[PDB]
């Protein structure tokens, strides 16, 4: 058992974007889609820190 | 005065540290290349200086050694004397000690 | 005259005497020994010795000069600030007319120009 | 609108007067306590009168 763990371990360190490569880069544009839709819409005070997250649920 | 008075004129950082007091750290203290990487520069260097950099080299080594003498007037005769008669302002251009 | 909040410490030790007092910062932790309610902004608390001024201020109109004044938290803080615009009328002329006895002065220690060195 | 009172501004012309103004105005944040409220904060509500440190009457008799 542990030279299997250790065996799948490896190949999913070597290879698995064979798979996962796909679900990555959809997460990493909606990592920076949303925060794209964050600036938008949020209140930021004199300094850039969102001091209201709570006045809508939009913004929650 | 206290015995143990130094005064310093680079920026130190002292631990906040019970029982212990030391400097912990530099301010904007930048790491360079590591013992490895600074040996393969200098190999690259010594490498080309021994195969295309060791022609006419004996004619410079005497300019050299002339030029650590005390006099002047003791240059110019290590010259003339060793170095084939070679002009003091002609040499010391060659060595780089010309502005 | 100090035209800052903040100056190096270094700068008011001396460097051919020993040094046996600092010119500290205001001791904030004073500030929170009154019992009783003010209200103090964190833009006055930095500048030299005018903490200790407001404080005793503010202890002098709550309680009076007579009985109930005198208590540590008050006393300590019209002490502090006889204390510190004394030391630091000291410093200021120590700073203006004897500023070679400091740490970091070019004429504590002088460098000399070149055409002493005689080469 | 503004306000005039006592306490007058330090500038020559109108046009720098009315400058500071809107320097000052663009940096308000309202903080309001009811609901319903484009600017409501229960909590981390500032004031809007600015507290001055004076020799009270115990202190001057
Ligand atoms: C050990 C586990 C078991 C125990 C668990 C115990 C958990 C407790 C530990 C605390 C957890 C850490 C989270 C603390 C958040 C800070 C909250 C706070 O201080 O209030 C400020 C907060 C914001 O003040 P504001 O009026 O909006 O400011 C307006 C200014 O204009 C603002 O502009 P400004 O220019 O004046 O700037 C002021 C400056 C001030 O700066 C500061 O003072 C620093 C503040 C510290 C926060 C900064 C870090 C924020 C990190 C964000 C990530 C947090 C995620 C949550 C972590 C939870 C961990 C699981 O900036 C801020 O205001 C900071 C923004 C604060 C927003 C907080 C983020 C919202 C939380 C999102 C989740 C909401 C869950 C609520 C569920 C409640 C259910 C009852 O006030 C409120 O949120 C009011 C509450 C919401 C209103 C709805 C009514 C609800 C009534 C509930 C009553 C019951 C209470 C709970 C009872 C529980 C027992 C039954």
Redesign the pocket.
Known sequence: GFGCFSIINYLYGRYGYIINESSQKRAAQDLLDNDMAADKIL?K??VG???????SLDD? | MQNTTNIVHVPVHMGHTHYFDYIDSFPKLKEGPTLEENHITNQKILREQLISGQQGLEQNLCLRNCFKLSQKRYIEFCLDRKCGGADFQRAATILGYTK | TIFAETWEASEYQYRNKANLKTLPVNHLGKLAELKFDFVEYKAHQLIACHLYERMTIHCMNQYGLFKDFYRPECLDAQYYFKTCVELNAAYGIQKKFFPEHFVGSPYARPVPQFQQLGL | PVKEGQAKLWFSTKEEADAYDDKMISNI?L?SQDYEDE????????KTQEYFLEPSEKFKS
């Open positions: 209140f005070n004199r820190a969102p001091t209201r997250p709570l006045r929650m | 944040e903080k600017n409501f904060s229960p909590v981390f509500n500032r």
